[PDB]
Design a protein around this ligand. Sequence first.
Ligand SMILES: OC[C@H]1O[C@@H](O[C@H]2[C@H](O)[C@@H](O)[C@H](O)O[C@@H]2CO)[C@H](O)[C@@H](O)[C@H]1O
Length: 130
Amino acid sequence: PKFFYIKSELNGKVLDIGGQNPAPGSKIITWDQKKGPTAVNQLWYTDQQGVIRSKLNDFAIDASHEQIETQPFDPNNPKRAWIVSGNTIAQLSDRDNVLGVIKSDKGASAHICAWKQHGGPNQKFIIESE
Ligand SMILES: OC[C@H]1O[C@@H](O[C@H]2[C@H](O)[C@@H](O)[C@H](O)O[C@@H]2CO)[C@H](O)[C@@H](O)[C@H]1O
């Protein structure tokens, strides 16, 4: 029941499941922080292991494709176990691999990818209580 927002230190927006799409494989973007029962697609929590999940469907963050998207949690899939570590959303099995915001080149909402930690604010996040 302890949910939170993940805000980018790059654009000050927050991780958000694209268009509130509940289906697995939905792209995760950054969007203006909403408030109320409509913020569900922007709310996250950590399971007992500390692995990040979405309040919307309990799905985990998955970095199997070009951009991060939601996918059912699988303890056997290394690209679906992401945890909070200070200012970074780190891959549980490889802390050197962290999430980072990447602005759009087409004037759309920014997307997210996972790559080597390079110290930029694009790879820093702030956990913000609900
Ligand atoms: O565009 C991302 C943005 O979508 C909001 O939801 C919209 C969707 O964008 C729009 O195309 C559709 O017609 O209506 C949806 C309901 O508002 C999300 O609420 C927002 O968080 C972003 O994900």
